[PDB]
Amino acid sequence: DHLPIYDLDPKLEEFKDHFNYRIKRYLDQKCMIEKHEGGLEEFSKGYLKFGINTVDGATIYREWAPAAQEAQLIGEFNNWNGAKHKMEKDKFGIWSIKISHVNGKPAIPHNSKVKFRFRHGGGAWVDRIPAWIRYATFDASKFGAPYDGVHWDPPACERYVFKHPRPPKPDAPRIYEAHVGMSGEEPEVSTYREFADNVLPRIRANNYNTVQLMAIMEHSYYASFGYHVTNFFAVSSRSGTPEDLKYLVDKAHSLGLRVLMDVVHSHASNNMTDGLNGYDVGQNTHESYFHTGDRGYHKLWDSRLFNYANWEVLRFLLSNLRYWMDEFMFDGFRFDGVTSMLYHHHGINKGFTGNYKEYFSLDTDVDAIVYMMLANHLMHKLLPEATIVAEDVSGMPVLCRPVDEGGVGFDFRLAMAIPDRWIDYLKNKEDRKWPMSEIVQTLTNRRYTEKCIAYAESHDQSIVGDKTIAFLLMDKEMYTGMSDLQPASPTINRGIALQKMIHFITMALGGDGYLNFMGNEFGHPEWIDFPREGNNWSYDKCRRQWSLVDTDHLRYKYMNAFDQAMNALEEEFSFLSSSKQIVSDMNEKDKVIVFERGDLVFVFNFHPNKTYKGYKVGCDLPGKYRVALDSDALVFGGHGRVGHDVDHFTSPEGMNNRPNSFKVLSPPRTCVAYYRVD
Ligand SMILES: OC[C@H]1O[C@H](O[C@H]2[C@H](O)[C@@H](O)[C@@H](O[C@H]3[C@H](O)[C@@H](O)[C@@H](O[C@H]4[C@H](O)[C@@H](O)[C@@H](O[C@H]5[C@H](O)[C@@H](O)[C@@H](O[C@H]6[C@H](O)[C@@H](O)[C@@H](O[C@H]7[C@H](O)[C@@H](O)[C@@H](O[C@H]8[C@H](O)[C@@H](O)[C@@H](O[C@H]9[C@H](O)[C@@H](O)[C@@H](O[C@H]%10[C@H](O)[C@@H](O)[C@@H](O[C@H]%11[C@H](O)[C@@H](O)[C@@H](O[C@H]%12[C@H](O)[C@@H](O)[C@@H](O)O[C@@H]%12CO)O[C@@H]%11CO)O[C@@H]%10CO)O[C@@H]9CO)O[C@@H]8CO)O[C@@H]7CO)O[C@@H]6CO)O[C@@H]5CO)O[C@@H]4CO)O[C@@H]3CO)O[C@@H]2CO)[C@H](O)[C@@H](O)[C@@H]1O
Numbered sequence: 001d002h003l004p005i006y007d008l009d010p011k012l013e014e015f016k017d018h019f020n021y022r023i024k025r026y027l028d029q030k031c032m033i034e035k036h037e038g039g040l041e042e043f044s045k046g047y048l049k050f051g052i053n054t055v056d057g058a059t060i061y062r063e064w065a066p067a068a069q070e071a072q073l074i075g076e077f078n079n080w081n082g083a084k085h086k087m088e089k090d091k092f093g094i095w096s097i098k099i100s101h102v103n104g105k106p107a108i109p110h111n112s113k114v115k116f117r118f119r120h121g122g123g124a125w126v127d128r129i130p131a132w133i134r135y136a137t138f139d140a141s142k143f144g145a146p147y148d149g150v151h152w153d154p155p156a157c158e159r160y161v162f163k164h165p166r167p168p169k170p171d172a173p174r175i176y177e178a179h180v181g182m183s184g185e186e187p188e189v190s191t192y193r194e195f196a197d198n199v200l201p202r203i204r205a206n207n208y209n210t211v212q213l214m215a216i217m218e219h220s221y222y223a224s225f226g227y228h229v230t231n232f233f234a235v236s237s238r239s240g241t242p243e244d245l246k247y248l249v250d251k252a253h254s255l256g257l258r259v260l261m262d263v264v265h266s267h268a269s270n271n272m273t274d275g276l277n278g279y280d281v282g283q284n285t286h287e288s289y290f291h292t293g294d295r296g297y298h299k300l301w302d303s304r305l306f307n308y309a310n311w312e313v314l315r316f317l318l319s320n321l322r323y324w325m326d327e328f329m330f331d332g333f334r335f336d337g338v339t340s341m342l343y344h345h346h347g348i349n350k351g352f353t354g355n356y357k358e359y360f361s362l363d364t365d366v367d368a369i370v371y372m373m374l375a376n377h378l379m380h381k382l383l384p385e386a387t388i389v390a391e392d393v394s395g396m397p398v399l400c401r402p403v404d405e406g407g408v409g410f411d412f413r414l415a416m417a418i419p420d421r422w423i424d425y426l427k428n429k430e431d432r433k434w435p436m437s438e439i440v441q442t443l444t445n446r447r448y449t450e451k452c453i454a455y456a457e458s459h460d461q462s463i464v465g466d467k468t469i470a471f472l473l474m475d476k477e478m479y480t481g482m483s484d485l486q487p488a489s490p491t492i493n494r495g496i497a498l499q500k501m502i503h504f505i506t507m508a509l510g511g512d513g514y515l516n517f518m519g520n521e522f523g524h525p526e527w528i529d530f531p532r533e534g535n536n537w538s539y540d541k542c543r544r545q546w547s548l549v550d551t552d553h554l555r556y557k558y559m560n561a562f563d564q565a566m567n568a569l570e571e572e573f574s575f576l577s578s579s580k581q582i583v584s585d586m587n588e589k590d591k592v593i594v595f596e597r598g599d600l601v602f603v604f605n606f607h608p609n610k611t612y613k614g615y616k617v618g619c620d621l622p623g624k625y626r627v628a629l630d631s632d633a634l635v636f637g638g639h640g641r642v643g644h645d646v647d648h649f650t651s652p653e654g655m656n657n658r659p660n661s662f663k664v665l666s667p668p669r670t671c672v673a674y675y676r677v678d
């Protein structure tokens, strides 16, 4: 009847009807799950019943295949002959078999290959990888690099034991988005252990508190960046085994880092031999993971789309969430492609002006929203400290409100509008024509009842035609002009300064959390290019040149040190988790932005050349102000013009204006945060 979200946003009651239906569809589905499955928590334990599971004296294999008329389990254990391992179908379309132990040992050995062999209506037999397989390996020797499902039940001598607890939820997420495969300096696919031993310390040393782990779910197409999942329960085998990933998560927890995983429940790869799409043999949507016809196909991604209303699809996805959380001790997730799930048009060729009828209509996908609400309720009841992030460009209201208020249940939203604004400024505007108004409004125009994670550039700003901000600033000059033993050219000084500036203002003004993609913290040059036919499958641009930031006589160390000190500043002052956000000056003629966040006063000089001596900045309490972070510091690649022990005494006003003010030196292209001395 009445939802609490209506009190947060009166404009929502106009669409009560919509929400009514939506909430009804939620409460019914949950109710059904509680009546016939024992509740969401038990429903999400489906990976203990489906797939291959060892019990006392036998092994149970279950697989949902309504379209099959006959089915058997084949593998190395029966030399790919399922004659003595025929499965039986029930009224729900589920095939099952119990296989007794052989000489006291399980019938299917650990680390052996298995396949689900079934005959469909036409009369032909096909072999597929089990949908709930937990490991799948490819053989690059054979043509196709075809995958094989692998039964993963390691003995205690090689099963990883988690030794460290989950860290507490931070006051604000400082997220290091990473991809294990391209995390090494060698032009190859790196391993989970190499990432845990080499990269995680870099993340902790730069004072991040969260890692966003991409490309964990298995995907046969490496260049998909993990977005085209084939085996949803399998840890991507190109970087190691599931135990290696468990070791990665445990090591991150030992360093005090929280780990989120990329969850791709928005679509599925079209790969029929290796992936889930192989269970589509033409059956109707009520016997399939996916919709049929147009609704079952994503035109932009060339992918299959789930039928979120199906009982078995709900079991599949909710159990996938519980599987990742429980078996790998993840601290939360980022749901990718949420915009495509929210609307029947998937936002493919549609811009969202903000008109509420574009959010709440019959273009709204109620099945997917019901699934996401069930998912968020389940995940927050399993782990109240979990952080669930939604990757959504539309800005759907109440998307990040709890389920019990009428919301979708996400904790944070990705603030996906800032990067393109920065790109436009860098590409088509001269430095003296940059609008401070548009920058401030882009950083601050958001729904303040819902939390958001700001970032100047993510992984997508490194791929498919996008360059890093550092490269957009300096380009080929980075190849030759980044040595610390020679004076930096004007271009290099400009680029380093503006990179620090863009990152810092996006963090301090753009939301309630920060995200940075692996390598951009030190201005990694160029772009990311995956191995493909066009480059003869080169890994040259599918890696991270840690050499550049580690070398003392180069200048990347400056951007890295500024990133580290900026994260440490956020840790000490907690300005990302403070609602006090006052922009007290926006000098468009002088290109200066003065604002207040937390207990800090931020002065940004975006002017190309002019220094402002004795610039007056507003502040609340009178007293003694000093530099907390200054981008012109020599250790950050500046010229050291500001000076850190200088006392900025306040003077009351009258001898956006504030009670008191103090005067600062503001060199061009600089950012200084000031704190009040106790
Ligand atoms: O303590 C004590 C100590 O001791 C010791 O030490 C010592 C020692 O011993 C001694 O020796 C000394 O040292 C010293 C020395 O001597 C000196 O020399 C120095 O050195 C230094 C330096 O200085 C610095 O700088 C550094 O360096 C570095 C750097 O930094 C970095 O960077 C690196 O580099 C590198 C890189 O990385 C790489 O890469 C390479 O590069 C290369 C490349 O590759 C190639 O290619 C080339 O390039 C080139 C080209 O070719 C051409 O062409 C050009 O280009 C251009 C073009 O033409 C134009 O056109 C433009 O382009 C553009 C376009 O237009 C657009 O389109 C875009 O693009 C695009 C692209 O194309 C693509 O990629 C896209 O995408 C794609 C996708 O992905 C797919 O999928 C498909 O779709 O396709 C697509 C495509 O279509 O993307 C994009 C878009 O987004 O854009 C573009 C661009 O913008 O433009 C361009 C430009 O750029 O040109 C180029 C260039 O020129 O070549 C290159 C080369 O150059 O390699 C490099 C190198 O070189 O690394 C480096 C090295 O490291 O460092 C150094 C060293 O350090 O100093 C020193 C000192 O400091 O002394 C010492 C002390 O004592 C012991 O040892 C120690 O330990 C101890 O401690």
Ligand SMILES: OC[C@H]1O[C@H](O[C@H]2[C@H](O)[C@@H](O)[C@@H](O[C@H]3[C@H](O)[C@@H](O)[C@@H](O[C@H]4[C@H](O)[C@@H](O)[C@@H](O)O[C@@H]4CO)O[C@@H]3CO)O[C@@H]2CO)[C@H](O)[C@@H](O)[C@@H]1O
Residues within 6 Å of the ligand: 036, 037, 065, 066, 067, 091, 092, 093, 094, 286, 287, 311, 312
């Ligand atoms: O009704 C109360 C029951 O609630 C729960 O049952 C679930 C099943 O577990 C789900 O599997 C599903 O059943 C679907 C099934 O997924 C789907 O394939 C379809 O079955 C086909 C079958 O494959 C085909 O071979 C043919 O012969 O029969 C059906 C024709 O389409 O439809 C089934 C019904 O939806 O959903 C139900 C709930 O709706 C719970 O698990 C049970 O314990 C409980 O009895």
